[PDB]
Amino acid sequence: KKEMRILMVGLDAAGKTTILYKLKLGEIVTTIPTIGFNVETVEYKNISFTVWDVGGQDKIRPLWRHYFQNTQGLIFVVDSNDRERVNEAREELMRMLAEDELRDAVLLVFANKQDLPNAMNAAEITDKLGLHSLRHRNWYIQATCATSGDGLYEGLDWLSNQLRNQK
Amino acid sequence: MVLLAAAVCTKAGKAIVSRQFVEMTRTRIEGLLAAFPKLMNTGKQHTFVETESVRYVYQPMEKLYMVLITTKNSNILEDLETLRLFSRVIPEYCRALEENEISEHCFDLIFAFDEIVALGYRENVNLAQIRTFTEMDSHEEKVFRAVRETQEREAKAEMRRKAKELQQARRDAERQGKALKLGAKGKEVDNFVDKLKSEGE
Amino acid sequence: MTAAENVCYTLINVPMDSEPPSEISLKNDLEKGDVKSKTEALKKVIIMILNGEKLPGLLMTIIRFVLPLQDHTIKKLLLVFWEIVPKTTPDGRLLHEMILVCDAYRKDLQHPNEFIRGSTLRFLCKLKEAELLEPLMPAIRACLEHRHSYVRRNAVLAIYTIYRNFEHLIPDAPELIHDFLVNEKDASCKRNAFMMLIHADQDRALDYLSTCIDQVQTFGDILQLVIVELIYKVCHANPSERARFIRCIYNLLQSSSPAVKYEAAGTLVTLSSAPTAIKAAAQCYIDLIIKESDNNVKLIVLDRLVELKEH
């Protein structure tokens, strides 16, 4: 099985840990904001994805740099209901994408919490994050509900196909 | 009434392992352990040494000494029972009472010593309880692991099922385009109290 | 603080016979080794740090590759590693990396293995960093209600040390431990709860003792010794209380435990100067010297008779 290292990052309360355990255990884990990281191995289509869920709190964001090394795919989780912090999520994403160690990393953006009535749609998040300005980077945005699991498998299927063609 | 430290020393006076149960500086405990071999009197029929500040209580173990460092006001009866318990713990981990085996098993000894004494007070433990506590064999952990392995198996089965469905959906999308009573209990205590009252207390 | 002025709970004087493992070798064994190689590498790292070597480059390697392991030996060795590793910068600030370690302590306090919980609680008694203890307080409190006496007895000691060093983290600790002591059945848990109350709140310890004073003779020797220690401290601070406890201490002179007899005789001399009380204590010492076969006991109890004679 091809082993792939994936870094999952984003702001606090974006639902990163809920996505990770929904993929691994099939269940919704009610998570307090992650004050650390989780590492879990998820198997999809004979690829073993080692996913690193790093906490998104302001105190933890400076530590994301330590996880960039040997990252083949980047999953950026955004709370699509949090309109106030979308600009902060854009700045942090752009700061990460400027790092040379992430230059060859494939970007998957999860527009999470699409089940909420005030959630920004995937197109509005694409514009607010400025994803169309990214040159020479393969990116995809998927609308996701971490609680139902909707869109999570479509995002992984895209990631698996991209990482299979990169060799 | 406080056990300060427990140490295993060579007959040459080298401390191999020491565990402290109270807040001591490294310089203080190393000083106390370095003084011990010079303070040891040979040819005496007792196994303690007192300084101005501390008491050493020790037991010879072939080429080694098991040493307890206590306060001068520590209860010697409790300290001797504690010393006997420490001396019985060493052979449970070390087959030979030599410096090399004590050095190889130093962490197992530290873990066993922490089961005997907490904050300078002796725990009510026997050798079999120390063994049980150091083995860490938990029934709850075994049950928790068995439940978690079962959940991981189910999640793996579901993930394989969804992976097949997605791969099939892609292929289909590509295809479609009255006796006299003598003696009352407690009379001795009452007589003692009545004597003390007669003495003005 | 220099390593020599720091609190030292462990001394290991192993002759480093073999070439001292390079930091790069240790790092490779910790990252890529099997559980046995990781265990031996971690033992070597602990011994090197105890002998005054500074290995700051290994901290994150241990956090990433050793901390998530579920091996019981590695879990215990990690508690010894966290006891000795510098947690603060030279300027006294907590290292940023320690936040990742704090979540591991919280997981270990919730671990299904009761011995991991108990060992982690015992380690927390040695922690001096309030910022690491604050997020653990809910998990430490939950360990008081644990089904195993091994967890409960160590949870009482953890609460006692946290209250003593950082009262603001658990200001209700004396009340919480009093309610624990009243409901507890395990003798070791009762002793540890009572010992905390002697140091933190003597009035609550006295209130508990007042409910059980007539039953003290039926208690285990460990609980009797801690009760004698309370009676000594209270009667030393407040001489008016002596009249209340003389009868209890005299009953403890008849204990089956020679350790309790010795401590009760020593305490009786401090409670009463009356000739009858001194005679009872002196006879108890003479009887201990005659009955006890150990020359260490004979000599030390003889010194108590010599101290009595100096008055």
From Swiss-Prot, chain A:
It holds the Pfam family Arf. Changing residue 85 to H: In PVNH8; uncertain significance. It comes from the Eukaryota. The keyword Membrane applies. The keyword Acetylation applies. It catalyses: GTP + H2O = GDP + phosphate + H(+). One of its GO terms (biological process) is intracellular copper ion homeostasis. It is an enzyme of class 3 (hydrolase). Coiled coil: none annotated. Keywords: Acetylation, Disease variant, ER-Golgi transport, Golgi apparatus, GTP-binding, Hydrolase, Lipoprotein, Membrane, Myristate, Nucleotide-binding, Protein transport, Synapse, Synaptosome, Transport. SUPFAM superfamilies: P-loop containing nucleoside triphosphate hydrolases. GTP binds at residues 10-18, 112-115, 146. It is found in: Golgi apparatus membrane; Synapse, Synaptosome; Postsynaptic density. Disulfide bonds: none annotated. It is a lipid-anchor. One of its GO terms (molecular function) is protein domain specific binding. One of its GO terms (cellular component) is focal adhesion. Its main location: Golgi. It is linked to Periventricular nodular heterotopia 8: A form of periventricular nodular heterotopia, a disorder resulting from a defect in the pattern of neuronal migration in which ectopic collections of neurons lie along the lateral ventricles of the brain or just beneath, contiguously or in isolated patches. PVNH8 is an autosomal dominant disease characterized by developmental disabilities, speech delay, seizures and attention deficit-hyperactivity disorder. Small GTPase involved in protein trafficking between different compartments. Modulates vesicle budding and uncoating within the Golgi complex. In its GTP-bound form, triggers the recruitment of coatomer proteins to the Golgi membrane. The hydrolysis of ARF1-bound GTP, which is mediated by ARFGAPs proteins, is required for dissociation of coat proteins from Golgi membranes and vesicles. (Microbial infection) Functions as an allosteric activator of the cholera toxin catalytic subunit, an ADP-ribosyltransferase. Belongs to the small GTPase superfamily. Arf family. This is ADP-ribosylation factor 1. It comes from Homo sapiens (Human). The gene is ARF1.
From Swiss-Prot, chain B:
The modification N6-acetyllysine is found at residues 187, 195. It is found in: Cytoplasm; Golgi apparatus membrane; Cytoplasmic vesicle, COPI-coated vesicle membrane. It comes from the Eukaryota. The modification Phosphoserine is found at residue 198. Residues 168-177 have a biased composition (Basic and acidic residues). Belongs to the adaptor complexes medium subunit family. Delta-COP subfamily. Oligomeric complex that consists of at least the alpha, beta, beta', gamma, delta, epsilon and zeta subunits. The coatomer is a cytosolic protein complex that binds to dilysine motifs and reversibly associates with Golgi non-clathrin-coated vesicles, which further mediate biosynthetic protein transport from the ER, via the Golgi up to the trans Golgi network. Coatomer complex is required for budding from Golgi membranes, and is essential for the retrograde Golgi-to-ER transport of dilysine-tagged proteins. This is Coatomer subunit delta. It comes from Mus musculus. The gene is Arcn1.
Curated annotation (Swiss-Prot), chain C:
HEAT repeats lie at residues 96-131, 132-168, 240-276, 277-311. The keyword Ligase does not apply. It is found in: Cytoplasm; Golgi apparatus membrane; Cytoplasmic vesicle, COPI-coated vesicle membrane; Cell membrane. Disulfide bonds: none annotated. One of its GO terms (biological process) is intracellular protein transport. GO terms for cellular component: COPI vesicle coat; COPI-coated vesicle; cytosol; endoplasmic reticulum-Golgi intermediate compartment; Golgi apparatus; Golgi membrane; plasma membrane. The modification N-acetylthreonine is found at residue 2. Predominantly expressed in the upper one-third of the oxyntic mucosa and in most regions of the pyloric mucosa. Ubiquitously expressed including platelet, liver, heart, spleen, lung and kidney. Its main location: cytoplasm. GO terms for molecular function: structural molecule activity. Oligomeric complex that consists of at least the alpha, beta, beta', gamma, delta, epsilon and zeta subunits. Interacts with CAPN8. Interacts with SCYL1 and PRKCE. Interacts with COPG1. Interacts with ARF1 (myristoylated); this interaction is required for binding of COPB1 to Golgi membranes. Interacts (via trunk domain) with ARF1 (via switch I region); the interaction is direct. Interacts with KCNK2 (via N-terminus); this interaction increases the channel-mediated whole cell currents and promotes plasma membrane expression of KCNK2. Interacts with STX17. Interacts with TMEM115. The coatomer is a cytosolic protein complex that binds to dilysine motifs and reversibly associates with Golgi non-clathrin-coated vesicles, which further mediate biosynthetic protein transport from the ER, via the Golgi up to the trans Golgi network. Coatomer complex is required for budding from Golgi membranes, and is essential for the retrograde Golgi-to-ER transport of dilysine-tagged proteins. This is Coatomer subunit beta.
